[PDB]
Amino acid sequence: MKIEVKESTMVRPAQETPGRNLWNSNVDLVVPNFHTPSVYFYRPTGSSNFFDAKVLKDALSRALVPFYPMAGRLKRDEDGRIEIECNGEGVLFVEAESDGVVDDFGDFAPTLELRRLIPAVDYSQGISSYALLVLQVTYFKCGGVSLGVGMRHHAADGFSGLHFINSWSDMARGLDVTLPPFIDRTLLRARDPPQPQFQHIEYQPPPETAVSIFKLTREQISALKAKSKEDGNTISYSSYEMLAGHVWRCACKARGLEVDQGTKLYIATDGRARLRPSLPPGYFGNVIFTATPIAIAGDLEFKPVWYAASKIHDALARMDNDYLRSALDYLELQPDLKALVRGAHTFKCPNLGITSWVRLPIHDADFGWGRPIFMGPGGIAYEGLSFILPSPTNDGSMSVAISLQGEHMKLFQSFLYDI
């Protein structure tokens, strides 16, 4: 597939915006595990102005007025801490053309080939040299379009980033911002003095890859949830805990782990509902923390799926305000946060990462020509990472996108359908 860039624009906010040196909390400075660019696919409607680039760029420039930090750049304060200089320098918007068709991407699994739909970022001319958000609209031969989105993690997590992208789509339709962003990350300042109450292994560094996507129907999901009754168990677990448990159990079996091999599952957890007092709605920044259930492979494989679900349940139930405040305090005491590199190491066999986008508004971006037929990660960056996606047809199905070693993938597919 040839992808040609046709035009590139640095889009500035539509009018001047306030200056500010926007402070980053310790969870805006840590690289989140599950940070990823995303891609949306749209089918042509027959409209002659489908994804008109002037309409998209004018709306983007208007959306950057209330979301002005998105238009800013990174810089170091007087103490060397990375902050966002809100200078309105703008967001990169690339228009590209493909000589292939949307159907060339098949089920839209996040292979490295999807990275080609998001602008590449040259993070080697120093922290100020690049935009915090890069966007690419690619026009395909049969009229389909992709939108690729790459946002630098200091700016926002996925929740705040989709707020922006949805708000841009609203403006493209003529609706002003429905929930204005609340911009003040000092609400996540650590205590003074900082005093952790727990160990936080998720921030302690440790002392061929294939990617696929697999659809489970609403009935398969309901059949999985019903397995909580197995072997007399009386505790009900949610669709999410049972599906996440089943993905973990299936990955252990597909990798052929020994009965006494240990496995850590890292689960992205949004702190917005859990912190006290809870953050104002529209909080703009990062609030993702990591839960870490640990189990023996023989127990996960040989006990019913509710055992893996129970471990996930217990681990998420530990993620309360006390735990999240402790995590911020632990980070405050570390000499170097850049050093807390959460990379390829972390999710490799026998460990695993799972993040769910089921409760995120990933299909709400309608720029005037309809909601997307698919939205998902634009390429999965580390082997051992998995994403649970809600259905773009609103039919109660859920898709599991995952990266595994190639010789484990067909086993994983086989075990995922053993429900």
Q: How many CA atoms lie within 13 A of 63 on its CB side?
A: 28
Strands 91-98 and 133-139: parallel
Contact 314/293 with Cβ under 8 angstroms?
yes
Nearer to Cl ion, 140 or 168 (CB): 140
Q: What tokens appear for 112 in the block?
A: 């490295």
Long-range contacts of 410-417 (CB under 8 A, 24+ apart): 411/253, 411/254, 411/256, 412/250, 412/251, 412/254, 413/212, 413/214, 414/254, 415/249, 415/250, 415/253, 415/254, 416/214, 416/216, 416/246, 416/247, 416/250, 417/220
Please give the angle made by the CA atoms of 175, 177 and 179, to the nearest 5 degrees. 135
From the list 144-152, 228-236, 352-360, 407-415, the region that binds Cl ion by CB under 5 A is 144-152
Number of residues interacting with Cl ion: please give it, by CB under 5 A: 5
CB of 98 to Cl ion, least distance (A): 8
User: Are 139 and 99 spatial neighbours (Cβ–Cβ below 8 Å)?
Assistant: no
User: 41, 42, 68, 140: which one contacts Cl ion (CB under 5 A)?
Assistant: 140
Q: Which of 391, 376, 383 is nearest to 158 (CA)?
A: 376
3-class SS shares of the chain: helix, strand, coil, % to 5: 30, 25, 45
3-state secondary structure at position 121: coil
CB of 140 to Cl ion, least distance (A): 4
- Helices 239-254 and 406-416: crossing angle in degrees, nearest 10, is 140
Q: Is 323 in the site for Cl ion (CB under 5 A)?
A: no
Smallest separation (angstroms) from Cl ion to the CB of 1: 11
Q: Which residue in 37, 88, 144, 271 binds Cl ion (CB under 5 A)?
A: 144
For residue 250, give the amino acid letter: C
Which residue stretch of 13-21, 94-102, 205-213, 346-354 sits at the interface with Cl ion (rule: CB under 5 A)? 94-102
Return the range that interacts with Cl ion (CB under 5 A); candidates 75-83, 135-143, 206-214, 279-287: 135-143
In whole angstroms, how close is the CB of 373 to Cl ion at the nearest point? Answer: 11
Q: Which of the residues 58, 184, 364, 366 is marked catalytic?
A: 366
Specify the residue, 140 or 357, whose C-beta has the smaller distance to Cl ion: 140
Closer CB to Cl ion, 98 or 286, in the complex:
98
Residues 392 and 221: their CA atoms lie apart, in Å, by: 16
Catalytic residue among 28, 35, 153, 170: 153
- C-beta nearest to Cl ion: residue: 144
The residue from 1, 5, 10, 101 that contacts Cl ion (CB under 5 A) is 101
From CA 268, how far away is CA 356, in angstroms rounded? 8
* Binds Cl ion by CB under 5 A, chosen from 22, 27, 102, 308: 102
The letter for the amino acid at 211 is: V
Stretch that binds Cl ion, among 69-77, 93-101, 154-162, 169-177 (CB under 5 A): 93-101
Active site residue 153: yes
Q: Does 372 bind Cl ion (CB under 5 A)?
A: no
Site string for Cl ion, 302-321 (x = CB under 5 A): --------------------
53 contacts 137 by C-beta, under 8 angstroms:
yes
E strand or H helix that includes residue 312 = helix 305-317
Q: Would you state the structure tokens that stand for residue 26, as one six-digit string?
A: 């310790």
**CB neighbour class for 354 (10 Å; exposed up to 12, middle 13-18, buried from 19):** buried
The stretch near Cl ion (CB under 5 A) out of 133-141, 220-228, 250-258, 333-341 is: 133-141
Of the pair 102, 297, the CB lying nearest Cl ion is at: 102
Query: Candidates 51-59, 98-106, 175-183, 250-258 — which segment interacts with Cl ion by CB under 5 A?
Result: 98-106
Among 31, 112, 142, 223, binds Cl ion (CB under 5 A): 142
CB of 44 to Cl ion, least distance (A): 7
Q: Is 122 a catalytic residue?
A: no
Minimum CB distance to Cl ion, residue 50 (Å): 11
Nearest CB to Cl ion, comparing residues 51 and 289: 51
Rounded to a whole number of angstroms, the minimum distance from the CB of residue 51 to Cl ion is 12
Catalytic residues: 153, 366
Residues at the contact surface with Cl ion, assessed by CB under 5 A:
101-102, 140, 142, 144
